[PDB]
Amino acid sequence: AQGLAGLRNLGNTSFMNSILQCLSNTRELRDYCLQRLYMRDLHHGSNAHTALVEEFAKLIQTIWTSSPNDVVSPSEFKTQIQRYAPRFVGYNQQDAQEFLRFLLDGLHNEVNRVTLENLDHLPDDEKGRQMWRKYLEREDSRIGDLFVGQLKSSLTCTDCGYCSTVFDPFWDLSLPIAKRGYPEVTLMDCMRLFTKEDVLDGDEKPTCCRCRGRKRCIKKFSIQRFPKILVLHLKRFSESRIRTSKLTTFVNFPLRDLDLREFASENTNHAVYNLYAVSNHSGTTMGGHYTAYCRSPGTGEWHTFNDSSVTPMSSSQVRTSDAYLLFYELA
Amino acid sequence: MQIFVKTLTGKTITLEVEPSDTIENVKAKIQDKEGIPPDQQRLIFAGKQLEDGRTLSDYNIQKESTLHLVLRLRGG
Ligand SMILES: [Zn+2]
Protein backbone atom coordinates (compact mmCIF):
# COMPACT_ATOMS: atom_id res chain seq x y z
CA ALA A 1 0.00 0.00 0.00
CA GLN A 2 2.68 2.49 -1.12
CA GLY A 3 0.93 3.92 -4.21
CA LEU A 4 4.01 3.69 -6.46
CA ALA A 5 2.31 2.10 -9.48
CA GLY A 6 3.05 3.32 -12.97
CA LEU A 7 0.37 4.05 -15.55
CA ARG A 8 0.57 2.72 -19.08
CA ASN A 9 0.61 5.34 -21.83
CA LEU A 10 -2.36 4.45 -24.07
CA GLY A 11 -1.30 6.72 -26.94
CA ASN A 12 -0.41 10.32 -26.17
CA THR A 13 -1.95 10.02 -22.68
CA SER A 14 0.92 11.27 -20.47
CA PHE A 15 -1.19 14.39 -19.73
CA MET A 16 -3.82 12.09 -18.20
CA ASN A 17 -1.30 10.02 -16.28
CA SER A 18 0.33 13.09 -14.78
CA ILE A 19 -3.00 14.42 -13.52
CA LEU A 20 -4.10 11.01 -12.28
CA GLN A 21 -0.93 10.68 -10.19
CA CYS A 22 -1.35 14.18 -8.73
CA LEU A 23 -4.91 13.21 -7.77
CA SER A 24 -3.77 9.81 -6.46
CA ASN A 25 -1.51 11.69 -4.04
CA THR A 26 -4.18 14.22 -3.02
CA ARG A 27 -4.62 12.63 0.42
CA GLU A 28 -8.29 13.34 1.06
CA LEU A 29 -9.37 12.55 -2.51
CA ARG A 30 -7.44 9.29 -2.40
CA ASP A 31 -9.04 8.43 0.95
CA TYR A 32 -12.54 9.19 -0.40
CA CYS A 33 -11.87 6.53 -3.05
CA LEU A 34 -10.12 3.98 -0.80
CA GLN A 35 -12.82 4.19 1.91
CA ARG A 36 -15.56 3.87 -0.78
CA LEU A 37 -17.26 7.03 0.54
CA TYR A 38 -18.30 7.97 -3.02
CA MET A 39 -20.80 5.08 -3.13
CA ARG A 40 -23.25 6.89 -0.85
CA ASP A 41 -22.89 10.13 -2.89
CA LEU A 42 -23.64 8.58 -6.32
CA HIS A 43 -26.98 9.51 -7.87
CA HIS A 44 -29.78 7.00 -8.32
CA GLY A 45 -30.99 6.20 -11.80
CA SER A 46 -29.58 5.11 -15.12
CA ASN A 47 -26.92 7.84 -15.54
CA ALA A 48 -24.42 7.99 -18.42
CA HIS A 49 -21.52 9.05 -16.15
CA THR A 50 -21.73 7.09 -12.81
CA ALA A 51 -19.07 4.80 -14.31
CA LEU A 52 -16.70 7.83 -14.42
CA VAL A 53 -16.56 8.04 -10.60
CA GLU A 54 -16.50 4.24 -10.28
CA GLU A 55 -13.62 3.78 -12.71
CA PHE A 56 -11.66 6.71 -11.26
CA ALA A 57 -12.04 5.28 -7.76
CA LYS A 58 -11.15 1.76 -8.93
CA LEU A 59 -7.98 3.10 -10.55
CA ILE A 60 -6.97 4.87 -7.32
CA GLN A 61 -7.79 1.68 -5.36
CA THR A 62 -5.57 -0.30 -7.74
CA ILE A 63 -2.69 2.17 -7.44
CA TRP A 64 -2.84 2.03 -3.62
CA THR A 65 -2.96 -1.78 -3.47
CA SER A 66 -0.10 -2.22 -5.98
CA SER A 67 3.32 -3.75 -5.37
CA PRO A 68 6.75 -2.31 -6.30
CA ASN A 69 7.29 -1.94 -10.09
CA ASP A 70 3.61 -2.60 -11.02
CA VAL A 71 2.29 -0.86 -14.14
CA VAL A 72 -1.47 -0.61 -14.49
CA SER A 73 -3.72 0.37 -17.37
CA PRO A 74 -6.16 3.28 -17.05
CA SER A 75 -7.96 2.20 -20.27
CA GLU A 76 -11.41 1.64 -18.68
CA PHE A 77 -11.12 5.03 -16.97
CA LYS A 78 -10.21 6.68 -20.30
CA THR A 79 -13.34 5.22 -21.91
CA GLN A 80 -15.44 6.88 -19.19
CA ILE A 81 -13.76 10.31 -19.16
CA GLN A 82 -14.00 10.60 -22.97
CA ARG A 83 -17.74 9.83 -22.73
CA TYR A 84 -18.12 12.74 -20.28
CA ALA A 85 -15.75 15.03 -22.22
CA PRO A 86 -15.60 13.94 -25.89
CA ARG A 87 -12.60 16.19 -26.63
CA PHE A 88 -10.55 13.35 -25.03
CA VAL A 89 -11.70 10.68 -27.48
CA GLY A 90 -8.85 9.17 -29.46
CA TYR A 91 -5.15 9.59 -28.92
CA ASN A 92 -4.04 13.17 -29.45
CA GLN A 93 -1.78 15.25 -27.22
CA GLN A 94 -3.69 17.40 -24.73
CA ASP A 95 -3.24 20.04 -22.03
CA ALA A 96 -3.13 18.71 -18.45
CA GLN A 97 -4.96 21.66 -16.89
CA GLU A 98 -7.76 21.33 -19.46
CA PHE A 99 -7.98 17.64 -18.56
CA LEU A 100 -7.93 18.41 -14.82
CA ARG A 101 -10.81 20.85 -15.14
CA PHE A 102 -13.04 18.48 -17.14
CA LEU A 103 -12.21 15.48 -14.96
CA LEU A 104 -12.89 17.23 -11.66
CA ASP A 105 -16.09 18.77 -13.05
CA GLY A 106 -17.29 15.34 -14.19
CA LEU A 107 -16.48 13.74 -10.82
CA HIS A 108 -18.07 16.66 -8.96
CA ASN A 109 -21.26 16.51 -11.03
CA GLU A 110 -21.69 12.80 -10.32
CA VAL A 111 -21.29 13.07 -6.52
CA ASN A 112 -23.00 16.47 -6.14
CA ARG A 113 -25.09 16.47 -2.93
CA VAL A 114 -27.46 18.82 -4.76
CA THR A 115 -29.54 16.70 -7.17
CA LEU A 116 -31.78 19.53 -8.52
CA GLU A 117 -31.00 39.71 -5.26
CA ASN A 118 -29.45 43.13 -4.56
CA LEU A 119 -27.13 42.91 -1.52
CA ASP A 120 -25.84 46.54 -1.40
CA HIS A 121 -27.20 46.85 2.16
CA LEU A 122 -24.78 44.12 3.40
CA PRO A 123 -21.16 44.59 4.45
CA ASP A 124 -18.67 43.05 1.97
CA ASP A 125 -17.86 39.98 4.01
CA GLU A 126 -21.52 39.18 4.62
CA LYS A 127 -22.29 39.62 0.91
CA GLY A 128 -19.41 37.19 0.26
CA ARG A 129 -20.83 34.68 2.75
CA GLN A 130 -24.30 34.91 1.18
CA MET A 131 -22.93 34.49 -2.36
CA TRP A 132 -20.95 31.47 -1.10
CA ARG A 133 -24.09 29.93 0.42
CA LYS A 134 -25.88 30.48 -2.94
CA TYR A 135 -23.04 28.75 -4.80
CA LEU A 136 -23.08 25.75 -2.44
CA GLU A 137 -26.85 25.43 -2.97
CA ARG A 138 -25.91 24.48 -6.57
CA GLU A 139 -22.42 22.92 -6.22
CA ASP A 140 -21.84 20.84 -3.08
CA SER A 141 -19.64 17.76 -3.32
CA ARG A 142 -16.64 16.09 -1.74
CA ILE A 143 -14.64 17.20 -4.79
CA GLY A 144 -15.62 20.81 -4.12
CA ASP A 145 -14.85 20.37 -0.41
CA LEU A 146 -11.24 19.98 -1.45
CA PHE A 147 -10.66 22.34 -4.38
CA VAL A 148 -13.09 25.27 -4.19
CA GLY A 149 -12.28 28.76 -2.95
CA GLN A 150 -13.77 32.20 -3.48
CA LEU A 151 -12.25 35.30 -5.06
CA LYS A 152 -13.38 38.82 -4.33
CA SER A 153 -13.14 41.19 -7.29
CA SER A 154 -13.28 44.84 -6.28
CA LEU A 155 -14.00 47.30 -9.10
CA THR A 156 -13.56 50.94 -8.05
CA CYS A 157 -14.70 53.85 -10.18
CA THR A 158 -11.95 56.48 -10.08
CA ASP A 159 -14.56 59.23 -10.61
CA CYS A 160 -17.40 58.56 -8.11
CA GLY A 161 -15.48 56.22 -5.78
CA TYR A 162 -18.06 53.43 -5.85
CA CYS A 163 -16.50 49.99 -5.38
CA SER A 164 -18.58 47.23 -6.93
CA THR A 165 -17.74 43.80 -5.53
CA VAL A 166 -18.40 40.37 -6.95
CA PHE A 167 -17.41 37.00 -5.60
CA ASP A 168 -16.27 34.35 -8.07
CA PRO A 169 -15.74 30.74 -7.02
CA PHE A 170 -12.53 29.10 -8.21
CA TRP A 171 -11.19 25.54 -8.34
CA ASP A 172 -7.67 26.60 -9.40
CA LEU A 173 -5.84 29.88 -10.11
CA SER A 174 -4.20 30.54 -13.45
CA LEU A 175 -1.29 32.88 -12.85
CA PRO A 176 0.49 35.16 -15.31
CA ILE A 177 4.25 34.79 -15.27
CA ALA A 178 6.38 37.82 -14.38
CA LYS A 179 8.91 38.76 -17.11
CA ARG A 180 11.97 38.48 -14.88
CA GLY A 181 12.70 38.61 -11.16
CA TYR A 182 15.56 39.65 -8.92
CA PRO A 183 17.43 37.51 -9.43
CA GLU A 184 14.55 35.14 -10.39
CA VAL A 185 10.81 35.03 -10.95
CA THR A 186 9.03 33.65 -7.90
CA LEU A 187 5.63 32.09 -7.43
CA MET A 188 4.78 35.03 -5.19
CA ASP A 189 5.61 37.41 -8.08
CA CYS A 190 3.10 35.52 -10.22
CA MET A 191 0.47 35.61 -7.45
CA ARG A 192 1.05 39.38 -7.24
CA LEU A 193 0.48 39.72 -11.02
CA PHE A 194 -2.79 37.89 -10.58
CA THR A 195 -3.97 39.92 -7.56
CA LYS A 196 -2.60 43.37 -8.44
CA GLU A 197 -4.54 46.50 -9.20
CA ASP A 198 -5.57 46.25 -12.86
CA VAL A 199 -6.12 49.67 -14.41
CA LEU A 200 -9.05 49.61 -16.79
CA ASP A 201 -8.87 52.65 -19.05
CA GLY A 202 -8.80 53.50 -22.76
CA ASP A 203 -10.35 50.60 -24.69
CA GLU A 204 -10.99 48.76 -21.40
CA LYS A 205 -13.05 51.45 -19.53
CA PRO A 206 -16.00 49.79 -17.81
CA THR A 207 -19.36 51.49 -17.63
CA CYS A 208 -19.96 52.84 -14.14
CA CYS A 209 -23.72 52.64 -13.60
CA ARG A 210 -23.51 55.30 -10.85
CA CYS A 211 -21.82 57.76 -13.27
CA ARG A 212 -23.89 56.32 -16.18
CA GLY A 213 -20.87 56.35 -18.47
CA ARG A 214 -17.54 54.77 -19.24
CA LYS A 215 -14.95 55.55 -16.55
CA ARG A 216 -11.40 54.64 -15.62
CA CYS A 217 -11.72 51.90 -12.99
CA ILE A 218 -9.34 49.89 -10.82
CA LYS A 219 -10.00 46.14 -10.52
CA LYS A 220 -8.37 43.98 -7.86
CA PHE A 221 -8.64 40.36 -6.83
CA SER A 222 -8.29 39.13 -3.27
CA ILE A 223 -8.94 35.68 -1.82
CA GLN A 224 -12.11 35.65 0.26
CA ARG A 225 -12.08 31.91 0.97
CA PHE A 226 -9.04 29.65 0.66
CA PRO A 227 -9.41 26.06 -0.56
CA LYS A 228 -8.14 22.98 1.23
CA ILE A 229 -6.22 22.10 -1.94
CA LEU A 230 -4.82 25.02 -3.93
CA VAL A 231 -4.00 24.27 -7.55
CA LEU A 232 -1.81 26.89 -9.24
CA HIS A 233 -1.58 26.88 -13.02
CA LEU A 234 1.32 28.82 -14.58
CA LYS A 235 0.38 30.63 -17.80
CA ARG A 236 3.32 29.35 -19.85
CA PHE A 237 2.19 30.78 -23.18
CA SER A 238 3.18 33.96 -24.96
CA GLU A 239 0.56 36.47 -26.14
CA SER A 240 1.93 36.65 -29.71
CA ARG A 241 -0.72 37.62 -32.24
CA ILE A 242 1.00 35.38 -34.82
CA ARG A 243 2.20 32.19 -33.08
CA THR A 244 2.11 31.29 -29.38
CA SER A 245 5.33 29.95 -27.93
CA LYS A 246 5.87 28.24 -24.62
CA LEU A 247 7.27 30.35 -21.77
CA THR A 248 9.99 28.24 -20.15
CA THR A 249 10.87 30.79 -17.44
CA PHE A 250 11.98 29.30 -14.15
CA VAL A 251 9.39 30.14 -11.51
CA ASN A 252 10.73 29.52 -8.03
CA PHE A 253 7.95 27.93 -5.95
CA PRO A 254 8.36 26.78 -2.35
CA LEU A 255 8.13 23.22 -1.06
CA ARG A 256 6.85 24.45 2.30
CA ASP A 257 5.33 27.52 3.92
CA LEU A 258 3.63 29.16 0.95
CA ASP A 259 2.11 32.00 2.95
CA LEU A 260 -0.75 33.78 1.16
CA ARG A 261 -1.43 36.47 3.84
CA GLU A 262 -0.88 39.34 1.42
CA PHE A 263 -3.57 38.05 -1.00
CA ALA A 264 -6.34 37.54 1.52
CA SER A 265 -9.28 39.94 1.52
CA GLU A 266 -9.02 42.79 4.06
CA ASN A 267 -9.32 41.42 7.60
CA THR A 268 -9.90 37.86 6.26
CA ASN A 269 -7.92 34.99 7.81
CA HIS A 270 -5.31 33.66 5.40
CA ALA A 271 -3.86 30.24 4.62
CA VAL A 272 -0.37 28.69 4.54
CA TYR A 273 0.35 25.70 2.27
CA ASN A 274 2.89 22.95 1.59
CA LEU A 275 3.53 21.49 -1.86
CA TYR A 276 2.57 17.87 -2.50
CA ALA A 277 2.48 17.45 -6.30
CA VAL A 278 3.68 19.02 -9.54
CA SER A 279 2.62 18.34 -13.13
CA ASN A 280 5.61 18.96 -15.42
CA HIS A 281 5.50 19.60 -19.16
CA SER A 282 8.50 19.25 -21.45
CA GLY A 283 8.10 20.35 -25.07
CA THR A 284 6.35 23.08 -27.03
CA THR A 285 2.76 24.30 -26.98
CA MET A 286 1.98 21.80 -29.80
CA GLY A 287 3.50 18.69 -28.31
CA GLY A 288 5.61 17.27 -25.56
CA HIS A 289 5.39 14.99 -22.58
CA TYR A 290 4.09 15.20 -19.03
CA THR A 291 5.40 13.73 -15.80
CA ALA A 292 4.40 14.23 -12.18
CA TYR A 293 6.42 14.73 -9.03
CA CYS A 294 4.35 13.65 -6.03
CA ARG A 295 4.90 13.42 -2.31
CA SER A 296 3.41 10.24 -0.83
CA PRO A 297 0.78 11.18 1.80
CA GLY A 298 2.00 8.40 4.14
CA THR A 299 5.82 8.53 3.90
CA GLY A 300 6.44 12.15 2.78
CA GLU A 301 8.93 10.90 0.17
CA TRP A 302 8.88 12.32 -3.38
CA HIS A 303 8.69 10.21 -6.53
CA THR A 304 8.75 10.92 -10.24
CA PHE A 305 5.83 9.31 -12.06
CA ASN A 306 6.61 9.13 -15.77
CA ASP A 307 4.02 6.91 -17.41
CA SER A 308 5.04 3.36 -16.45
CA SER A 309 8.19 4.45 -14.61
CA VAL A 310 8.03 5.42 -10.96
CA THR A 311 11.36 6.40 -9.39
CA PRO A 312 12.43 7.97 -6.08
CA MET A 313 13.68 11.57 -6.13
CA SER A 314 15.19 14.06 -3.68
CA SER A 315 13.12 17.12 -2.72
CA SER A 316 16.01 19.12 -4.25
CA GLN A 317 14.92 17.79 -7.69
CA VAL A 318 11.27 18.93 -7.40
CA ARG A 319 11.63 22.62 -8.37
CA THR A 320 12.27 22.85 -12.11
CA SER A 321 11.35 25.14 -14.97
CA ASP A 322 9.11 22.31 -16.35
CA ALA A 323 6.58 22.84 -13.55
CA TYR A 324 3.16 23.74 -14.99
CA LEU A 325 0.62 22.83 -12.29
CA LEU A 326 1.43 23.08 -8.58
CA PHE A 327 -0.70 21.23 -6.03
CA TYR A 328 -0.59 22.73 -2.54
CA GLU A 329 -2.27 21.47 0.66
CA LEU A 330 -2.97 23.38 3.86
CA ALA A 331 -0.02 23.32 6.31
CA MET B 1 -23.34 44.14 -19.57
CA GLN B 2 -19.63 44.05 -18.95
CA ILE B 3 -17.46 41.11 -17.98
CA PHE B 4 -13.71 40.89 -17.60
CA VAL B 5 -10.99 38.63 -18.93
CA LYS B 6 -7.70 38.12 -17.09
CA THR B 7 -5.34 37.62 -20.04
CA LEU B 8 -1.90 36.02 -20.32
CA THR B 9 0.69 38.49 -18.84
CA GLY B 10 -0.97 40.53 -16.04
CA LYS B 11 -3.64 42.59 -17.81
CA THR B 12 -7.41 42.54 -17.66
CA ILE B 13 -9.64 43.45 -20.59
CA THR B 14 -13.28 44.48 -20.60
CA LEU B 15 -15.89 42.92 -22.88
CA GLU B 16 -19.40 44.12 -23.64
CA VAL B 17 -21.69 41.09 -23.74
CA GLU B 18 -25.23 39.93 -23.15
CA PRO B 19 -26.25 36.79 -21.20
CA SER B 20 -27.28 35.26 -24.56
CA ASP B 21 -23.76 35.63 -26.05
CA THR B 22 -22.41 32.29 -27.09
CA ILE B 23 -18.95 31.22 -25.96
CA GLU B 24 -17.94 31.55 -29.63
CA ASN B 25 -19.17 35.20 -29.56
CA VAL B 26 -17.11 35.85 -26.43
CA LYS B 27 -13.99 34.30 -27.97
CA ALA B 28 -14.49 36.43 -31.12
CA LYS B 29 -14.67 39.56 -28.93
CA ILE B 30 -11.44 38.49 -27.24
CA GLN B 31 -9.82 37.92 -30.66
CA ASP B 32 -11.03 41.40 -31.78
CA LYS B 33 -8.91 42.89 -28.97
CA GLU B 34 -6.07 40.38 -28.44
CA GLY B 35 -5.40 38.66 -31.77
CA ILE B 36 -5.61 35.19 -30.20
CA PRO B 37 -7.78 32.93 -32.39
CA PRO B 38 -10.87 31.33 -30.76
CA ASP B 39 -9.49 27.83 -31.47
CA GLN B 40 -6.49 28.54 -29.21
CA GLN B 41 -8.45 30.15 -26.36
CA ARG B 42 -9.68 28.43 -23.23
CA LEU B 43 -11.84 30.38 -20.80
CA ILE B 44 -12.23 29.26 -17.18
CA PHE B 45 -14.97 30.47 -14.85
CA ALA B 46 -15.89 28.93 -11.48
CA GLY B 47 -13.70 25.91 -12.28
CA LYS B 48 -15.43 25.14 -15.58
CA GLN B 49 -13.99 25.56 -19.03
CA LEU B 50 -16.60 27.33 -21.14
CA GLU B 51 -17.68 25.34 -24.19
CA ASP B 52 -18.62 26.38 -27.71
CA GLY B 53 -22.37 26.06 -28.31
CA ARG B 54 -23.28 27.26 -24.80
CA THR B 55 -24.08 30.82 -23.71
CA LEU B 56 -22.91 32.97 -20.78
CA SER B 57 -26.38 32.47 -19.24
CA ASP B 58 -25.87 28.66 -19.31
CA TYR B 59 -23.02 29.22 -16.84
CA ASN B 60 -24.95 31.85 -14.84
CA ILE B 61 -22.15 34.34 -15.63
CA GLN B 62 -23.22 37.74 -14.27
CA LYS B 63 -21.96 41.27 -14.75
CA GLU B 64 -18.36 41.93 -13.65
CA SER B 65 -17.47 38.23 -13.48
CA THR B 66 -13.94 37.47 -14.64
CA LEU B 67 -13.06 34.79 -17.19
CA HIS B 68 -9.54 33.38 -16.98
CA LEU B 69 -7.86 33.09 -20.37
CA VAL B 70 -5.37 30.24 -20.73
CA LEU B 71 -3.68 28.56 -23.71
CA ARG B 72 -2.46 24.98 -24.10
CA LEU B 73 0.65 22.98 -23.48
CA ARG B 74 -0.21 19.84 -25.41
CA GLY B 75 1.61 16.71 -24.30
CA GLY B 76 1.37 12.98 -24.83
ZN1 LIG C 1 -18.57 56.11 -11.08
Residue numbers in the entry:
A (entry chain A): 263 to 378, 385 to 599
B (entry chain B): 1 to 76
What do the paper's sentences say?
The human genome encodes about 80–90 DUBs, of which the largest of the five DUB families is the ubiquitin-specific proteases (USPs). All of these studies suggest that the inhibition of USP2 may be a good therapeutic approach against cancers. In the present study, 6-thioguanine (6TG), an old drug still clinically used to treat leukemia, rheumatoid arthritis and bowel disease, was identified as a potent USP2 inhibitor. Further studies using enzyme kinetics and X-ray crystallography to delineate its direct binding to USP2 were performed.
In an earlier study, the structure of wild-type USP2 in complex with Ub showed a misorientation of the thiol group of Cys276 due to electrostatic repulsion between the residue and the carboxyl group of Ub-Gly7623. To resolve this, in the present study, the crystal structure of the USP2 C276S mutant in complex with Ub was determined at 1.24 Å resolution. Indeed, the hydroxyl group of Ser276 shows a 140° orientation change compared with the thiol group of Cys276. This change results in the rescue of the hydrogen-bonding interaction between Ser276 and His557 and the reconnection of the catalytic triad even in the presence of Ub. Moreover, in the present structure, one oxygen atom of the carboxyl group of Ub-Gly76 is located in the oxyanion hole consisting of the three amides from Asn271, Thr275 and Ser276. On the other hand, different to the USP2-Ub complex, USP2 C276S-Ub complex shows electrostatic interaction between residues Asp575 and His557. It suggests that Asp575 may directly influence the protonation of His557, not via the interaction between Asn271 and Asp57524. Interestingly, but not surprisingly, the USP2 C276S mutant still maintains 10% deubiquitinating activity. Furthermore, in the presence of 40 μM 6TG, the DUB activity of the USP2 C276S mutant decreases to 30%, suggesting that 6TG can still inhibit the enzyme without the disulfide-bonding interaction. Compared with those of wild-type USP2, the residues interacting with 6TG, such as Leu269, Gln283 and Tyr558, have no conformational change in C276S mutant, indicating the existence of 6TG binding pocket.
